[PDB]
Amino acid sequence: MLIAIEGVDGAGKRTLVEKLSGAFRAAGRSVATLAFPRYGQSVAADIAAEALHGEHGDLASSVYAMATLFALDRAGAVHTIQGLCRGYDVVILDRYVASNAAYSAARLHENAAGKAAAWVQRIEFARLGLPKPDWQVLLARDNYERDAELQQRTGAVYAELAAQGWGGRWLVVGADVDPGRLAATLAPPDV
Amino acid sequence: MLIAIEGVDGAGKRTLVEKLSGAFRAAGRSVATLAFPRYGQSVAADIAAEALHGEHGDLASSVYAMATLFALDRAGAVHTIQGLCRGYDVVILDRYVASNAAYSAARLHENAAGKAAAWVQRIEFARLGLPKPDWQVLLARDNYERDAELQQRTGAVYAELAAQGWGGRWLVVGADVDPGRLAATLAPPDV
Numbered sequence A, B: 001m002l003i004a005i006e007g008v009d010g011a012g013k014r015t016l017v018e019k020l021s022g023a024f025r026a027a028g029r030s031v032a033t034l035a036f037p038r039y040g041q042s043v044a045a046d047i048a049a050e051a052l053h054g055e056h057g058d059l060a061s062s063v064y065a066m067a068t069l070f071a072l073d074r075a076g077a078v079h080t081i082q083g084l085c086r087g088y089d090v091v092i093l094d095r096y097v098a099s100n101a102a103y104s105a106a107r108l109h110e111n112a113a114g115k116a117a118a119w120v121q122r123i124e125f126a127r128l129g130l131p132k133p134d135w136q137v138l139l140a141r142d143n144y145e146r147d148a149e150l151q152q153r154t155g156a157v158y159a160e161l162a163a164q165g166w167g168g169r170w171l172v173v174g175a176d177v178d179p180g181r182l183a184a185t186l187a188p189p190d191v
């Protein structure tokens, strides 16, 4: 059972991962988590963050370049994800491939059917062989405005991916989602 | 003994690697080679080549992005290079870190003391921990002109790196270099 938590609000996404983990562990199922990017454990992830803050020349001026770094991050964790799914009952990922497609398409002002989204699905799932997630849970100066526009675009792209079952079945939940009900819906009792 | 062969002429660089290998094997020393980028064995290297030919969106529009891909290529071969240097007497690399600095600086119209060159030395040797080479042997429509200018710039950057001992001692040789003399100069008899 590989579950990926997506959304634009990271602080709430982290909370949902905590409440969801406690619910699964309360039901007797073992849980293990992993957050992307893997800052401090992957050189590709650290480079991306550093490029964001002006390092590495023009590396940040290419959306696909940054997306590639993120994709390479998960590529190095493939055997780590496979190991967790074999030794644990539930594996919860804080952000996954869907994040790369939603934010990449938003930056390029594209939709779910855009070139950037299809490229993400192609390179990470088909070429890199990243495990397909069983569930993808969507949690619904002047620079302050240039950001809010990217969040709304990313959030809309998220809504498109979930509506079309991008990379697997989805499940849209609000911040007020009940953890017990969500964990019972993702992994019902009696297998 | 880690030896790196550099230069702008790849066809001649490949020949020098062959003649140099035969000379070392004639002296009783065992030899093993490895060429960068590692097309077909590294996903980062293949992505770079594919980006060159129009794939991966704008990934190719960033020099540092491509340089990062090349650097990540060698980063994955670090333990492979260390294994060869332990089981073989001589390890000859067809292109190495110096290539990334010479061509990157040439594309950005920079010199050896430019930002791009220093970045290559910083990220690949200091951060990624790539083994320092004992020797770095330098082999000295309208689009046909836009290329010849890059080769001369790269060749000049090469000349600068070798003159200042960039990343280690260098050795400039022409295509007419004698293989027996070169192998005797890089690894003299009697240790």
Ligand SMILES: Cc1cn([C@H]2CCCN(Cc3cccc(Oc4ccccc4)c3)C2)c(=O)[nH]c1=O
Residues within 6 Å of the ligand: A036, A037, A048, A049, A052, A060, A062, A063, A066, A067, A070, A071, A095, A096, A097, A099, A100, A101, A103, A104, A107
């Ligand atoms: C795991 C993941 C996450 N993200 C976003 C999710 C929201 C937070 N950012 C943080 C971040 C890190 C590094 C660089 C960066 O700025 C960029 C990213 C891409 C292009 C240009 C600048 C943003 C990363 C992606 O875009 N793709 C991913 O694959």
Ligand SMILES: Cc1cn([C@H]2CCCN(Cc3cccc(Oc4ccccc4)c3)C2)c(=O)[nH]c1=O
Residues within 6 Å of the ligand: B036, B037, B048, B049, B052, B060, B062, B063, B066, B067, B070, B071, B095, B096, B097, B099, B100, B101, B103, B104, B107
């Ligand atoms: C091993 C190596 C090699 N090269 C060059 C040595 C001369 C041949 N090219 C071939 C090549 C491959 C992929 C892309 C490419 O075009 C670029 C490269 C960088 C930026 C933009 C386009 C060229 C690679 C580097 O620039 N850095 C390296 O680290």
